[PDB]
Design a protein around this nucleic acid. Structure first.
Lengths: 141, 722, 548, 493
RNA sequence: UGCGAAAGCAGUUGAAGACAAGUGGCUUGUCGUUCGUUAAAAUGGCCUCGUCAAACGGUGGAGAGAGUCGCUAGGUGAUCGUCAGAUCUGCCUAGUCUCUAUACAGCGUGUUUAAUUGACAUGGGUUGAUGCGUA
């Protein structure tokens, strides 16, 4: 090609990222589903993770997360964050799970030393969901 | 390269600190002194000196120069034919010039050229001369309107004239002024036809014997340049689209050449058979300077044989009687048919009266191969200064920069501005930051995008590859005031530190595992005040970072990335409130650091934790630079000192359009002014190349530097076989 | 250039050992050791010893005795080894070697015949160097470095008995000519205030620096370029800096002339014969952040005033960018004399202090930028008005409008005049957030709440607000929520800050439901006026009329 | 002059859980085959040499499948009890099978009728039989006799070495892949013993205490070996006798392992693990045995294998389940007068001094929207956006190119009811996504700015505007509640 | 236009002269005219140099598509009916379940961290659109 011809712009396979991925630093309760959820999260079992969080009764979700062990509430929250990042219609039903994980395990993940670095994907997903709120405010006006 | 300032032979013609209207106006190939014997050129300047210069071998140390007996006239051009020589001159009502043609002779006393005065034209609007130089056309403004007159100059073969209302259509008199304004004209080597290019976009070939016209409509914006071929059967035209068209005048058939990195402000055929086209490309994405690229190209395959260009910086403001060229609408890249006079009056008044006379730019030096990278608008000119020719040119944003010649409305769109770029200290990566602007008259027209890109090349290839880009670093709509590359001790010189106008900092670094440049460290404060008077510095050890926000120089560490702390409280002063917002925090070496703010210039030691020296800046740099540009005005070294740099706009007996530069150096914490230099022109950027020199960029872009039997048979055979 | 300053034989062991340091003793029989226990046998003792070392075995120990030779000891087992005499004059500083590293038969008198670490292995006779008063052993390529008071430097390598280099080093009577921490140099201290580093590969000075103050017992630490130095008649062992992977914190070197300062670690209490107390407990020299602490060996501050770029035909200054003036006529002598003109009998009046300050600094009396000023000068005139004399109407208005006020601002709540207090809220450019939060939560229910919330938001980071607004009671925050709900943008985000910083659980319910209802209607009105701001042909048959 | 820059497809910031190269490669193992066996598939080995066939050990038969048709080419049915192990020799020439009566029978592969020799091992069931990987003429059989045996296949009467020492149920052998004297055996008491065969052989030289009862031990390097048993697997440096990684990423016991090297893959090595709960997972030995991909199967997976390192054809992952069936997932791969007349067209300049090259490279074909943006047909470019078969990022990038480049209004000028309905009917779908909704916002804003009268006239885009209103209502409830979650974890810092 | 932060905060928009049109003046409008102020349109758009097919290597994906009326949560309709509720085995959406050449998109394989080969005489002539129906 010519020597005076400028180089065109080409991204190629450059990784486009945002500025918000901080990935670097007797019974009497119900019949819940938390053994299913716990041995979904001990492995990486997307299939039975989907069969445990297609349950959407609020008291079942509530005491399920209450009976959950708090050392893996952070990875339940990571799985929920990645699923609502990918599928956008899940944000309605699945963020009921993410608000209950914060309310119940409000001590474990305030005692964790790097909250944003450990659940970066939630922060990036909610930042990109709520960043454009003035724009669709102007749109619906 | 015949350097003018190399010798007093013709630097005595011009070395002035105030007067650069002495200009070089024509070059001829022969020798006007003695005929019939050529390997040397005779240059006519715009005042009346005629220098004869040998460009084969070493330049002679006494050229054959003369000075023609001239009136107040100022030398439009000279003309050559067989044997004879003409010259044309300009004059002193409505502001129009006035032209006057002489003929030359030389022979009797070999110091003076005698002149003859053929004729005059008492008001000239526009002019052109044919390719052979045998005839010339021009415009008149003689009443209801203008007029058009063609005249052969080396003979009275033909001289005709007519009002151009007989050229113009009947539709144009009830249409806009662009339809009757004419921005170009050309004649062929016979004077049979003439091309009138109008500001509306059309061209019209009139046939001069009978004044019948033919319209050629392709240019959707103003026609800026026209030329004929030698036989007159092809018309080259160029305009605001960056497309050179050539019209086959038999069938009216265009051949195009579409993406010519600048608008064609002049085009002409060049060879005896017409095998070259020479073009001038105005490159009008920056409105702050008129930077022309000279490009001839062979006519066979239309490839750019020998494109020529100077360095292309973009200054923060317009420079010196710079007028962006004519067009159809008044845009942010051009001006309409009305506003050229008002714009030049306003620009002269702005250079006289106003206060923010800062037109300073950022230039970078690639620390591997010592070539300097002028970031143009949405592009970079990589340019090496040991031969002062451009390495290449590369588009670094995603605009409509290259894909399209923008026209009358579309010139109100701007491609994203590259405002920062810095190399990592081993020269392996190039960090760049750009502001992507939205088009007007829609919902998202008032939120910018801020994009930080990371480029890589090996040491052979001339162009960089984007490895990653982060859109909105630091958050949405927030700028990056300063990026700083990191020293060789953090991630093997593969980290960058970006600063907000919130005082937030982000440390980005390239790790090989996830093979990308990712976000490592973060310190965000959430204030409610913003200021772009942000500066940054790093310790060479890689231990502590000096975050010079406005009025406040915080001291952060690197391990926990918060403000510095020792529990023993050994007068751990980790903030230095100064009298004004600080714009340079340049640390010369690990002992001390020079702060520069808009009143004073302090220096602070850290092995003796207090102020050591101070200087007064307010009488020199008061409210004249934008806050954040003292960092490009002053610089440092790694051993041998620090360089301040001030500017005095000169005065009459009010300020003027003339400038002088006062650069000063200091060694070893502001001790001695061991360099006090004065340069004849405004100075725009100074920076230390990595081998103990400091390069600076003049406002007219001269880069300067502050440093430390058989013999006769052989001769006759090389004659007779060449 | 100091370090963290406090604390007013096998050379690489520590504690949990028995005695890896057996050393000689002043005014005693020969030698001793102690534990935190190994036996103290004899290495053919009772001579004129001045130091004592071992072969890095502690049961092949010795007593380095001034008899031209030395033998082995049995400090663990009971079985001795044989020896062989070389000289008979003075071997008081004998240092037995490792497995063939650095050994020669140099006793005291220029007879450095090379040998090995054995009782009968020999080498060449490398006694060529002159009478050296400072012979040390380093590990460049294990080498005897001789500095001679015939003055000349030489360096022989006891790896092939090869004289590497040598020159004429004019070294006088020294204090400690100790080898460097990386061994590449020689730190030789001059007597009172100086310590020069010389190149110990070519015998030439590389950096001759002065020191801070009096120091006598100086030796290079196990650092990059740092030394330790104890005072002569002082127990003060300070540190200075002119191993790099995971450096030392204690047990670095034992050469000191304090009150029996043997076996000097960081916690240097349990000595080898002394049984003393301990001191500092820091590590060696770091890269560059500890030199902001140890900012010593320079204490020469003067009164730095703003100079000017020197007037070399300054009359061609070419359109100066000021308003009307060109240069302020600097009077630092009048700046100092204004102190005497102010510290007078204007004990309640503004006739001899405020007029004095506004005459010395001809300004608009609320504005900066006609500066020529020093922070010590402003602090001393602020002290002279904080003495016998806030009733001045010009001086203490024009100098909280100065960015160098230096922390005499704490009584700004403790004095309460309305206009001076609001001006010290808005413009005083260094304020303590403790007093700012106290003034914020000591509410007088006015617009100065907005003026104090403005500054507390616009000059402190949010987490530094949160950590120091944890330091509040609960009646303050309950009345703050009550006053916000009663009766704006910066106080909304301040309310966000108080909710983030009160904590998680320990709240009440009625205040929470009241705040919930209030901010529900607040979001509703914010939504509707955001909507308001974002809110800012022919038929087939007609019938018409015309003029008659 | 330059060439024209291509229209860059709008890529947003990347979302979490992107497609890694490892999981793209391991996800193109597809077209699953399910073959119902008579009983649980206990072992599966591959042919080493022409690595293109594999033997599946069901109950009382061993079937060799081909790696190009996936049908049973050959079968071995003349066992008396349940056949347990079946492996090929390192030359791939013959096939050993341990049987529940303790009768090792070795046939030759690809000939089920010629049983070559029947070693009568212990009276207990022989559960693992494999040849040496360096040597050819020795066969190691461990049985439920708590003693393994090395047999020379010439002298098949007494075992040439008898490796005893284990307290319970030796179920696995392994050989160390550079030292051929080194046999690592693994039993149901934990305790990977390993033996130097030049010594006595009744005592291991050392023992590695996997705490769970091991199910398999394989050798990865000449130095490190991996033992699975219980819910985890551990890796052991063998020159230093010392554990250095352990991954417990399963629910139930890891039944088997195998390992791949140097094959055509982004992963330079791969250890896959099969674990009685349905899962088979692949772990990358170069970044610390991190899991990269996995398959879930319809029952507890008892054994697994992949095609060997030099497969050169159709490549296989096979997993045999305890349910009694077998799952295969593969990745696949004019006249002499006229020629004498047109001879030279394949020469390419070998003996020729100068070789000129200015044939330009043929670039990718331009799509219709890209050539219409090139031809400045901006309304036609919008029309080419809203065809049905267009990718969502392609509609987004032509909207963004018309937004940045020229004029939304130019692209929308000559429209009416029938030619706006594609745009708004796509804007319904694009208003949900984050990456599109800014562009959807300003395009809808411009079209209602300059078509507010067609709003009055046509009722059949009024309803489209109403549906768009309820869409922005749902999206604004979502963008408000996301800010509420953002605040409610900003509280927890 | 100035100060600014990317928000915003203060300032506006005169005079002379000439010319054109309309009805020597009067009105209106222009200016390749000057002084002062910090101050939309002339049917008129971008070149050839070789395409097609099949791979391969990284990069993104809202995945490209097809089912099961299988589950979870919903939004809603026709007719009758006092409602209760009936039939339409009511419809639509999202998630889940199942499957495919990851079907989708993009950059590259001339040297690159990586990754490419093959077809074709890259012509001329005659019909080819009034010859066509599966709608």
């Amino acid at each position: 090609k010519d020597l005076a011809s400028a180089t065109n712009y080409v991204e190629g396979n450059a990784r486009v990222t945002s500025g918000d991925n901080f990935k670097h630093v007797t019974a009497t309760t119900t019949g819940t589903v938390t053994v299913i959820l716990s041995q979904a999260l001990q492995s990486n079992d997307h299939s039975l993770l989907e069969t445990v969080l297609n349950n959407r009764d609020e008291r079942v979700i509530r005491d399920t997360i209450f009976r959950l062990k708090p050392a893996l509430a952070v990875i339940l929250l990571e799985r929920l964050a990645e699923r609502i990042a990918r599928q956008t219609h899940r944000q309605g039903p699945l963020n009921v799970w993410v608000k209950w994980c914060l309310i119940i395990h409000g001590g474990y993940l305030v005692s964790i030393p790097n909250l944003m670095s450990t659940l970066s994907s939630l922060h990036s997903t909610l930042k990109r969901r709520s960043d454009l709120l003035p724009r669709l405010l102007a749109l619906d006006a | 390269t015949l350097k003018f300032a190399n010798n007093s032979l013709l630097s005595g013609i011009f070395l002035q600190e105030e007067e650069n209207n002495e200009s070089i106006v024509k070059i001829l190939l022969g020798d006007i002194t003695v005929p019939q014997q050529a390997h040397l050129i005779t240059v006519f300047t715009n005042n009346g000196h005629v220098i004869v210069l040998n460009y084969k071998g070493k330049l002679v140390e006494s050229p054959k120069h003369f000075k023609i007996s001239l009136a107040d006239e100022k030398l439009a051009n000279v003309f050559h034919s067989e044997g004879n020589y003409r010259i044309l001159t300009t004059f002193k009502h409505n502001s129009l010039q006035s032209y006057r043609l002489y003929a030359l002779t030389f022979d009797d006393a070999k110091k003076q050229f005698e002149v003859a005065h053929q004729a005059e034209w008492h008001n000239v609007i526009l002019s052109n001369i044919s390719s052979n130089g045998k005839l010339l056309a021009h415009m008149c403004k003689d009443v209801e309107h203008k007029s058009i007159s063609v005249v052969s100059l080396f003979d009275d073969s033909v001289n005709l004239s007519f009002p151009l209302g007989s050229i113009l259509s009947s539709q144009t008199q009830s249409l806009s002024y662009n339809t009757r304004y004419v921005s170009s004209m050309a004649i062929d080597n016979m004077g049979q036809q003439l091309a009138v290019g109008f500001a509306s976009g059309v061209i019209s070939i009139v046939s001069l014997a009978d004044l019948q016209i033919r319209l050629l409509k392709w240019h959707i914006d103003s026609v800026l340049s026209l030329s004929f071929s030698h036989d007159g059967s092809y018309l080259l035209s160029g305009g605001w689209e960056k497309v050179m068209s050539l019209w086959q005048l038999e069938t009216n058939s265009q051949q195009f050449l579409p993406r010519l990195n600048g608008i064609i402000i002049d085009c002409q055929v060049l060879g005896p058979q017409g095998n070259y086209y020479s073009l001038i490309l105005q490159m009008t994405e920056n409105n702050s300077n008129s930077d022309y690229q000279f490009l001839l190209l062979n006519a066979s395959d239309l490839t750019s044989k020998l494109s020529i260009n100077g360095p292309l910086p973009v200054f923060n403001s317009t420079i010196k009687h710079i007028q962006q060229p004519i067009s159809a609408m008044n845009t942010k890249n051009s001006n309409s048919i009305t506003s050229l006079n008002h714009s030049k009056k306003k620009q002269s008044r702005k250079l006289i009266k106003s206060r923010r006379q800062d037109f300073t730019t950022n230039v970078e030096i690639n620390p591997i191969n010592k070539n300097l990278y002028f970031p143009h608008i949405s592009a970079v000119q990589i340019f090496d200064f040991y031969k002062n020719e451009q390495v290449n040119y590369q588009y670094l944003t995603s605009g409509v920069n290259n894909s399209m010649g923008k026209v009358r409305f579309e010139l109100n769109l701007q491609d994203p501005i590259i405002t920062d770029l810095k190399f990592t200290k081993d020269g392996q990566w190039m960090i760049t930051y750009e502001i992507e602007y939205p088009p007007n008259d829609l919902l998202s027209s008032k939120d910018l995008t801020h994009i930080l890109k990371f480029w890589t090349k090996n040491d052979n290839e001339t162009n960089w590859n984007l490895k990653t880009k982060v859109i909105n670093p630091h958050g949405i709509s927030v700028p990056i005031t300063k990026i700083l590359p990191s020293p060789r001790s953090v991630n093997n010189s593969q980290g960058c530190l970006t600063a907000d106008n919130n005082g937030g900092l982000k440390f980005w670094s390239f790790d090989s595992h996830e093979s990308n440049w990712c976000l490592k460290k973060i310190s965000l404060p959430n204030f409610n005040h913003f200021s772009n008077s942000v500066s940054l510095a790093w310790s060479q050890d890689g231990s502590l970072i000096f975050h010079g926000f406005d009025d406040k120089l915080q001291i952060l560490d690197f391990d926990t990335f918060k403000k510095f702390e020792s529990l023993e409280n050994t007068k751990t002063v980790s903030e230095f409130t100064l009298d004004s917002e600080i714009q340079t925090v340049k640390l010369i070496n690990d002992t001390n650091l020079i702060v520069a703010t808009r009143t004073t210039l302090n220096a602070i030691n850290l092995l003796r934790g207090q102020v050591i020296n101070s200087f007064d800046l307010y009488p020199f740099v008061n409210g004249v630079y934008k806050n954040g540009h003292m960092d490009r005005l002053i610089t440092c070294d790694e051993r041998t000192g620090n360089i301040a740099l001030v500017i005095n706009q000169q005065l009459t007996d009010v300020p003027t359009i003339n400038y002088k530069s006062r650069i000063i150096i200091f060694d070893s914490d502001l001790s001695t002014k061991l360099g006090n230099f004065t340069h004849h022109e405004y100075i725009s950027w100074i920076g230390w190349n990595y081998d103990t020199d400091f390069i600076f960029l003049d406002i007219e872009s001269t880069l300067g530097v502050v440093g430390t039997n058989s013999d006769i048979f052989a001769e006759q055979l090389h004659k007779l076989s060449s | 250039d100091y370090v963290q300053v406090a604390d007013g034989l096998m050379v690489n062991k520590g504690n949990y050992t028995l005695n890896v340091i057996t050393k000689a003793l002043e005014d005693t029989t020969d030698t001793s050791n102690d534990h935190l226990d190994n036996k103290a046998y004899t290495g053919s003792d009772e001579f004129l010893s001045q130091y004592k070392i071992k072969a890095k075995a502690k049961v092949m120990s010795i007593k380095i005795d001034t008899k031209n030779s030395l033998v082995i000891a049995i400090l663990q087992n009971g079985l001795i080894e044989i020896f062989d005499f070389k000289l008979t004059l003075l071997h008081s500083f004998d240092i037995s070697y490792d497995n063939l590293k650095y050994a020669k038969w140099f006793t005291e008198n220029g007879t450095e015949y090379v040998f090995v670490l054995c009782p009968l292995q020999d080498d060449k006779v490398c006694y060529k160097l002159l009478e050296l008063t400072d012979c040390g052993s380093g590990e460049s390529s294990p080498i005897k470095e001789l500095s001679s008071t015939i003055i000349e430097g030489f360096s022989f390598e006891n790896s092939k008995l090869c004289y590497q280099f040598g020159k004429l080093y004019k070294l006088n009577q020294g204090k400690i000519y100790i080898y460097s921490l990386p061994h590449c140099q020689l730190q030789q201290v001059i007597e009172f205030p100086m310590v020069d580093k010389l190149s110990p590969g070519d015998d030439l000075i590389s950096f001759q620096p002065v020191s801070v103050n009096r120091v006598l017992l100086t030796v290079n630490n196990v650092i990059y370029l740092l030394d330790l130095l104890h005072c002569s008649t002082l127990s003060q062992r300070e540190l200075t800096h002119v191993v790099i992977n995971s450096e030392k914190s204690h047990n670095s070197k034992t050469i000191a002339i304090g009150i029996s300062t043997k076996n000097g670690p960081n916690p240097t209490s349990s000595l080898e014969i002394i049984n003393i107390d301990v001191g500092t407990n820091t590590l060696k020299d770091s890269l560059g952040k500890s030199f902001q602490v140890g900012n010593n060996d320079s204490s020469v501050i003067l009164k730095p005033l703003f100079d000017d770029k020197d007037i070399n035909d300054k009359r061609v200054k070419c359109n100066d960018v000021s308003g009307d003036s060109s240069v302020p006529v600097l009077h630092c002598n009048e700046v100092i004399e204004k102190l005497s003109a102010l510290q007078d009998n204007d004990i309640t009046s503004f006739d001899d202090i405020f007029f004095k300050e506004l005459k010395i600094k001809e300004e608009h009396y609320t504005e900066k930028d006609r500066y020529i000023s020093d922070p010590g000068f402003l602090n001393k005139v602020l002290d002279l008005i904080f003495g016998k004399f806030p009733k001045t109407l010009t001086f203490l208005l024009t100098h909280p409008l100065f960015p160098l006020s230096r922390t005499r601002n704490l009584l700004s709540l403790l004095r309460d005049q309305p206009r001076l207090f609001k001006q010290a809220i808005v413009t005083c450019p260094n304020l303590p957030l403790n007093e700012l939060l106290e003034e914020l939560f000591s509410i007088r229910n006015r617009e100065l709440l907005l003026d104090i919330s403005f500054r507390i938001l616009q000059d402190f980071t949010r987490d530094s607000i949160k950590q120091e607004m944890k330091k509040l009671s609960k009646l303050d925050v309950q009345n703050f929520i009550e006053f916000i709900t009663s009766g704006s943008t910066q106080l909304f985000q301040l309310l966000s800050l108080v909710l983030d910083s009160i904590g998680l659980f320990s709240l009440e319910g009625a205040l929470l439901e009241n705040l919930t209802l209030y901010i529900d209607k607040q979001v509703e009105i914010a939504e509707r006026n955001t909507e308001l701001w974002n809110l800012i042909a022919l038929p087939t048959y007609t019938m018409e009329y015309l003029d008659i | 002059s330059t060439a024209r820059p291509r229209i860059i497809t709008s890529k947003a910031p990347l979302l979490p859980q992107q497609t890694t190269p490892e999981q793209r490669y391991w996800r193109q193992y597809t077209s699953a085959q399910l073959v119902k066996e008579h009983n649980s598939v206990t072992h599966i080995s591959f042919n080493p040499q022409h690595p293109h066939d594999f033997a599946v050990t069901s109950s009382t038969r061993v079937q060799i499948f081909s790696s190009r048709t996936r049908q049973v080419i050959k079968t071995f049915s003349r066992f008396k009890d349940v056949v347990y192990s079946a492996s090929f020799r390192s030359d791939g020439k013959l096939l050993c099978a341990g049987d529940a009566t303790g009768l090792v029978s070795v046939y030759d592969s690809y000939n089920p009728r010629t049983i070559l020799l029947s070693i009568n091992a212990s009276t207990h069931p022989t559960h693992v039989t494999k040849f040496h990987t360096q040597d050819n003429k020795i066969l190691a059989t461990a049985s439920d006799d708590r003693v393994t045996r090395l047999w020379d296949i010439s002298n098949a009467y007494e075992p040439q070495l008898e490796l005893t020492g284990a307290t319970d149920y030796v179920r696995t052998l392994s050989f160390i892949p550079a030292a051929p004297h080194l046999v690592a055996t693994g039993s149901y008491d934990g305790l990977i013993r390993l033996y130097d065969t030049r010594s006595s052989g009744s005592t291991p030289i050392y023992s590695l205490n996997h705490d769970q009862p091991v199910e398999n031990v394989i050798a990865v390097s000449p130095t490190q070996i991996v033992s699975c048993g219980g819910n985890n697997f551990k890796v052991w440096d063998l020159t230093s006798n010392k554990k250095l990684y352990e991954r417990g990423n399963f629910n139930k016991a890891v039944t088997c392992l195998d390992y791949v090297e140097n094959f055509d893959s982004p992963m330079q090595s791969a250890l896959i693990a099969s674990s009685l709960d349905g899962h088979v997972k692949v772990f990358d030995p170069l970044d610390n045995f991190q899991v990269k991909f996995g398959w879930k199967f319809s029952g507890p997976v008892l054994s697994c294998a992949v095609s060997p390192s030099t497969a050169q054809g159709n490549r296989h992952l096979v997993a045999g389940l305890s349910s009694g069936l077998l799952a295969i997932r593969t990745k696949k791969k004019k006249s002499n007068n006229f020629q004498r007349m047109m001879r030279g067209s394949e020469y390419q300049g070998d003996q020729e001094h100068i070789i000129h090259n200015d044939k330009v490279r043929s670039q990718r074909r331009m799509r219709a929207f890209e050539r219409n943006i090139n031809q400045f047909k901006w309304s036609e470019a919008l029309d080419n956006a809203f065809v049905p078969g267009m990718a969502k990022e392609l509609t987004l990038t032509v909207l963004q190119e018309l937004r940045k480049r020229g004029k939304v209004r130019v692209a929308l000028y000559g429209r009416d009811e029938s030619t706006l309905e594609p745009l708004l009917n796509w804007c319904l779908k694009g208003i949900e996504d984050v990456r599109s909704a800014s562009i959807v916002a300003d395009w809808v804003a411009v079209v209602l700015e300059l078509y507010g009268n067609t709003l009055e006239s046509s009722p059949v885009l009024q309803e489209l505007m109403i549906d768009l209103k309820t869409k922005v209502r749902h999206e604004i409830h979502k963008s408000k509640e996301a800010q509420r979650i953002e605040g409610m974890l900003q509280l927890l810092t």
